[PDB]
Design an enzyme around this catalytic site. Structure first.
Site, PDB file in Angstrom:
ATOM      1  N   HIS A  66      -6.920   8.892   2.572  1.00 22.40           N
ATOM      2  CA  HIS A  66      -6.335   7.587   2.300  1.00 22.40           C
ATOM      3  C   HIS A  66      -7.213   6.787   1.362  1.00 22.40           C
ATOM      4  O   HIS A  66      -8.419   6.708   1.567  1.00 22.40           O
ATOM      5  CB  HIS A  66      -6.136   6.841   3.606  1.00 22.40           C
ATOM      6  CG  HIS A  66      -5.369   5.564   3.475  1.00 22.40           C
ATOM      7  ND1 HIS A  66      -4.230   5.450   2.710  1.00 22.40           N
ATOM      8  CD2 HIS A  66      -5.555   4.355   4.057  1.00 22.40           C
ATOM      9  CE1 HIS A  66      -3.763   4.219   2.804  1.00 22.40           C
ATOM     10  NE2 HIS A  66      -4.544   3.537   3.621  1.00 22.40           N
ATOM     11  N   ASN A  93      -5.987  -2.991   2.738  1.00 25.35           N
ATOM     12  CA  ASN A  93      -5.131  -1.828   2.945  1.00 25.35           C
ATOM     13  C   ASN A  93      -3.757  -2.092   2.317  1.00 25.35           C
ATOM     14  O   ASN A  93      -3.467  -3.219   1.922  1.00 25.35           O
ATOM     15  CB  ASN A  93      -5.019  -1.523   4.444  1.00 25.35           C
ATOM     16  CG  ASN A  93      -4.565  -0.096   4.738  1.00 25.35           C
ATOM     17  OD1 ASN A  93      -4.152   0.641   3.846  1.00 25.35           O
ATOM     18  ND2 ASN A  93      -4.634   0.289   6.007  1.00 25.35           N
ATOM     19  N   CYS A 128      -1.156   5.643  -1.802  1.00 25.09           N
ATOM     20  CA  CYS A 128      -2.302   4.743  -1.582  1.00 25.09           C
ATOM     21  C   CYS A 128      -3.242   4.736  -2.778  1.00 25.09           C
ATOM     22  O   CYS A 128      -3.806   3.704  -3.126  1.00 25.09           O
ATOM     23  CB  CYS A 128      -3.080   5.123  -0.321  1.00 25.09           C
ATOM     24  SG  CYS A 128      -3.354   6.906  -0.297  1.00 25.09           S
TER      25      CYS A 128
END
Ligand SMILES: *[C@@H]1O[C@H](CO)[C@@H](O)[C@H](O)[C@H]1NC(C)=O
Ligand SMILES: [Cl-]
Ligand SMILES: [Cl-]
Length: 310
Positions: free
Chosen positions: A258, A278, A114
């Protein structure tokens, strides 16, 4: 429309190295499906099964960042002060998705990358915003070539865990080639540095003060473009987020695992929210975007905000 395991299995095409593994696995799916049905629609927020729904909260969190984010390292690089506090007023709504053609939503898959997608996403946004160029950068090159074992001058751990600041650093000193030339395999590989192809750089980046105010963050987004944030992605509510505004979750969260991108903010009927880009495919949130309430450092959104400069 996934009601138990092997619809989930054939939808997400999951191969299991063992039968022992599957037994431990559909229980987590069942209890994740259990959590989804009991929570779906509450406070008018949609929740839904996804590719990750077969892991426990502990496992998913490890899947994202291998339990190895050095927060001491991350805090040390931040600005120590708020922004010079003289910027005027902020518009009630601001959405880079409407001001610019942002690039399509990506999917990190079974790899704790991520940090790489968030940095690449900001960089791609800036090329669209300042040059009206749509490029797709290689996250895989970040995964491999900022890998600490490969180049000790970087602190990342590939699919294990990583730092978007380290990624931008790489974008300055070396630059990234496009996806075409170094394709994504959601795994840590040996860095190929003799990849040719045009290289795209940034010239700098700056991490905001820990616990920055919403206002600083909004202004930063307005003046410097989409920003990387680090938050608590493995939280159940965020994990399964679909449509709706996530309210009342994990106020002032210190736990982060994250990396994602803020692309703007808005207000819907009394409720102030962030717009989050995202990297879990268009199947998560609303077309890959999620909405989280502002005003409370929800899920640690304000902890580690970083912008870049072309
Ligand atoms: C974390 O980073 C700090 C500062 O860079 C360093 O002093 C410390 O040894 C690191 N700890 C771990 C566990 O990596
Ligand atoms: Cl540098
Ligand atoms: Cl790997």
């Amino acid at each position: 429309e996934i009601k138990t395991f092997e619809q989930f299995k054939k939808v997400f095409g999951k191969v299991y190295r063992n039968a022992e593994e599957e037994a431990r696995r559909e229980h987590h799916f069942k209890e994740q499906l259990k959590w989804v049905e009991e929570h779906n629609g509450i406070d008018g927020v949609e929740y839904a099964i996804n590719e990750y729904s077969d892991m426990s909260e502990q496992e998913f969190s490890f899947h994202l960042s291998g339990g190895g984010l050095n927060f001491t390292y991350m805090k040390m690089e931040a600005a120590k002060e708020p922004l010079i506090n003289t910027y005027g007023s902020l518009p009630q709504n601001f959405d880079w998705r409407q001001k610019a053609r942002l690039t399509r939503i990506r999917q990190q898959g079974s790899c704790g990358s991520c940090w790489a997608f968030a940095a690449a996403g900001v960089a791609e946004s800036l090329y669209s915003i300042q040059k009206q160029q749509s490029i797709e950068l290689s996250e895989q090159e970040l995964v491999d070539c900022t890998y600490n074992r490969y180049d000790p001058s970087y602190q990342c751990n590939g699919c294990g865990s990583g730092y978007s600041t380290e990624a931008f650093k790489y974008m300055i000193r070396t630059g990234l080639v496009e996806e075409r030339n170094y394709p994504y395999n959601m795994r840590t590989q040996w860095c190929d540095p003799d990849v040719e192809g045009q290289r795209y750089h940034v010239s700098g980046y700056q991490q905001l003060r820990y616990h920055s105010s919403d206002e600083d963050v909004m202004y930063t987004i307005q003046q410097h473009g989409p920003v990387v944030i680090y938050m608590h992605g493995s939280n159940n509510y965020f994990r399964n987020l679909g449509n709706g505004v996530l309210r009342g979750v994990a106020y002032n969260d210190a736990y982060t695992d994250h990396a994602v991108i803020l692309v703007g903010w808005g207000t819907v009927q009394g409720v102030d929210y962030w717009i989050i880009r995202n990297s879990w495919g268009t199947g998560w949130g609303n077309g890959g975007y999620g909405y989280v309430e502002r005003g409370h450092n929800s899920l640690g959104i304000n902890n580690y905000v970083t912008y870049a400069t072309l």
